[PDB]
Design a protein around this ligand. Structure first.
Ligand code: NAD
Ligand code: NAD
Ligand code: NAD
Ligand code: NAD
Lengths: 253, 253, 253, 253
């Protein structure tokens, strides 16, 4: 069993990814802040007869991430795959104006928070697993971007900055780590039925479907399967790329 | 069985993709100009326990394409998949000057021939199977682009025009056909050792590999499995995209 | 006097560009199929104290292009700038299915004619001018692409193929011709108020503006001033790029 | 006189941009940390008969930025243009290895410092001028990206993240601000002859020119001119775009 670390595993796309990798025979190491959801995931994988650990790790805390990787290596001796999927949102206009003045603007903290998890988290986790991958002459680095990182989107300064930034780091690490048997790719999901989207008002959802050529909101499973494909020992000639899984949706103006 | 049309099936990437889809349990229809190699493909397929047909088809000839699609429908009733992989190269600088005179230039015919096969052939083939995919409310269209369609390349005015335009058409068709259960994607391969590439000077291949982060020339098999994955019934939320399989290679200037 | 060839000069963007370049002090050579509007353009340029010639040229016809470049060399001894702006539209769905049958489809000739003018024509004009730019060790090649070359669009298989493909050739030629003092660039306009556009249903034009961030249809002079800038002898470090002038409009799906 | 804020104005591209805007008749407010160099710039602009102020502003510090904008509005009543050109570099591999042993890795504070100036600072500055531009129904936001944000680059994890992220933020702001007469664009310079590049070894510089189609390193004035064009009151239909000024250079792997 190859070992795969999936961050943000306790919910949504990471939950699906975690499940898919386990069913495929990976030993899954699941990272998240959400401990109850974490244990629930493990219960789900045990019910499906898979092999996996859960660990409470903050991807944006260097000391937390370093300690987590050391424990994996001491227990299992290898990290084959890292999926950097942990994320957060705090949308809002740069400045929101009505009646001759600013009624709201994106809080400096809201900006910093989203960058810390969605950009800096990717850097920390990858930096931490890389030396092991190099020594093993193998690895798979898989980074969560977004369709929104390609086109931009209203109200998503911080989130777009992070997710376009993640594609950039993916291109760098592709170049640096190839010569060591490591590939580095990103995935850019469209609208996916995780909890945020499933809570959207009725009119907004059906417009989102109408704007999507294939005719639906995507499922976490769609992305999980995409990560599994990219992680294959047979996907050694795929590196430095961004695979869109967005039902053909392009974010109009 | 699901039916997959693979154009340019007789050699290289087409041949591997044909062998690959039939092994996965598709019924393959192989189209190519090269009858001898086409027949041998079918033989190899049938010996391995697969099912396939070959037909001599010039993808650039509308009448040829239309008849061949009608034959398939008459025999098998369906077209689940089309891989538009057939292509040719005829490289050359736009213009080559010396002694104050043009001494060589990309001939009109050689511009036209690459356009005809690599661009127009993709249009004709897709256009012919499209109505059958619509009625069945299911389809997979898969188009052969190139890394060089992304970045451009010295000496390839014609090939790059075709391969960049193929991505354009991929985006249109995704828009037009998604409503009918059809996805439309492209693959853009990097350096892949087909016949011609295998016969390139050792020194040149070495420099090509040196420019490739994962550290080798690619194999037809790398591409074959990429189409297979995009062609999956479980890959229905991937559409309008360009999947790069280039080992991380970026064509620098 | 620097000499600038403007193709499709009789109307729309081309007409504004010729007026613009002549006002800046270029000697303009206007190429178009439409002599009536062509000859009037020159009259107006002359009225304003500028310098310009008109020639009836089919940019898709190699002989007619070659002869016309020769005539310019014989008269003026030089070509400093070529603006490949000549274009045509013939839209339509790839196929249109009803009653279980194809009731309309993009005709082979529709596809071909747009490719011929919008892609081939750019190749022929650039090929014919290039040796003179090479001898002079100076040149500016400027290619008409479209916002729709970046994102694709419903109903535009042919137009998108050609415009995405024009960007591809722009990248090749930049690579081939830079060492001779020549830059090669493209512009991708959004919604611009030329003939057909100005005649579109008010309600449709209103929808198009609503999709445009800066809140209006563009004007041909928006484009003409962008070519002039790229054409500048002080724009010699811009090459291989695609300048978008689209008011921030992104063609949603 | 329109008012333009140029950040990182004391050296390199910022200095040339400040001089170019002054010569165009803008009142320039130059921002930088480098005070002596700040005074010298003002003295240069005075010698050329222009109008300009210098202020010591750390773009990464919210309090400093908002105090600086408030002083501009109190003194001049308007901010027409912001060029966010300030930047820093701290290069190095994610993980540097020899002997299957890690000899260096990108320090966390190294990652954080570059993100702080090159990404967050852009967000702070724009956010600080934007309400005034909205009130006035006019504005030009112009963000410094890099060719490296397009293709990635060995040893530039932190810098590429920032510069690719800046492009993302550019796309968000285009969407949000267009309705108020405000445009938002990025420029992506190639290799430009500022101090760092100028200090490069002979052999590395040679190869850099060799790999640049137009045959030289760019000059800061190349980029100054491009910012000026994009900031023109006649460039109101240019928004949401990234103009490359890189001499046709594409960063090979
Ligand atoms: N779902 C979408 O609509 C969508 C769209 C586009 C792109 N994406 C990408 O897919 C990724 C996951 O999206 P999602 O929809 O499943 O969201 P999600 O909320 O369902 O899951 C995020 C998980 O990450 C965890 N998490 C958060 N912060 C963390 C930290 N600092 N350390 C560790 N763990 C942490 C959360 O607790 C949560 O379980 C995102 O990073 C995003 O970039 C999603
Ligand atoms: N192999 C590479 O290095 C590489 C790289 C980048 C892109 N590609 C591409 O992927 C595709 C396959 O490349 P390949 O390397 O396998 O080339 P290939 O020469 O090995 O195979 C091409 C096949 O298409 C057939 N063919 C040609 N013209 C035709 C026509 N008019 N009608 C029908 N059939 C026809 C040929 O007979 C041949 O069997 C190509 O179209 C090309 O666009 C290849
Ligand atoms: N105007 C737009 O809305 C728009 C938008 C996006 C991209 N473009 C591109 O910019 C260019 C100009 O578009 P436009 O709106 O000004 O359209 P237009 O119809 O007003 O002008 C087209 C001109 O090209 C000429 N022309 C056509 N065919 C020719 C041939 N074979 N030889 C010579 N000359 C020829 C026509 O006579 C006409 O004068 C087009 O090539 C188009 O691809 C335009
Ligand atoms: N010149 C090149 O080779 C090149 C190539 C690509 C992109 N760029 C980009 O264009 C921009 C300019 O590059 P340059 O080469 O001209 O750089 P430079 O180092 O010459 O100048 C950068 C300026 O920013 C100032 N600065 C730094 N931190 C600051 C802070 N926190 N607050 C305020 N001011 C601060 C510096 O003192 C300096 O004057 C950069 O942002 C860079 O991203 C440059």
């Amino acid at each position: 069993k190859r070992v795969a670390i999936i961050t943000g595993a306790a919910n949504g796309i990471g939950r699906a990814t975690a499940l898919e990798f386990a069913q495929a025979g990976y030993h899954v190491v699941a990272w998240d802040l959400a401990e109850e959801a974490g244990a629930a995931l493990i219960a789900e994988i045990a019910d499906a007869g898979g092999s996996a650990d859960f660990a409470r790790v903050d991807v944006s805390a260097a000391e937390s991430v370093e300690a987590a990787v050391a424990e994996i290596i001491a227990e299992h001796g290898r990290v084959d795959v890292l999926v950097n999927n942990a994320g957060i949102l705090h949308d809002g206009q740069l400045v929101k104006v009505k009646g001759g003045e600013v009624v709201k603007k994106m809080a400096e903290a809201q900006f910093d928070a989203v960058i810390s998890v969605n950009l800096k988290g990717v850097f920390l986790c990858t930096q931490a697993v890389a030396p092991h991958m190099i020594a093993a002459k193998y690895g798979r680095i898989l980074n969560a971007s977004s369709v929104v990182g390609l086109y931009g989107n209203f109200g998503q300064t911080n989130y777009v900055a992070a997710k376009s930034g993640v594609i950039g780091m993916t291109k760098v690490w592709a170049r640096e780590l190839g010569r060591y048997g490591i590939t580095v790719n990103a995935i850019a999901p469209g609208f996916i039925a995780t909890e945020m989207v499933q809570q959207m008002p009725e009119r907004v959802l059906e417009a989102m479907v109408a704007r999507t050529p294939v005719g639906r909101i995507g499922d976490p499973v769609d992305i999980a399967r995409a990560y599994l494909f990219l992680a294959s020992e047979e996907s050694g000639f795929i590196s430095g790329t961004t695979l869109s899984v967005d039902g053909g949706m392009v974010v109009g103006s």
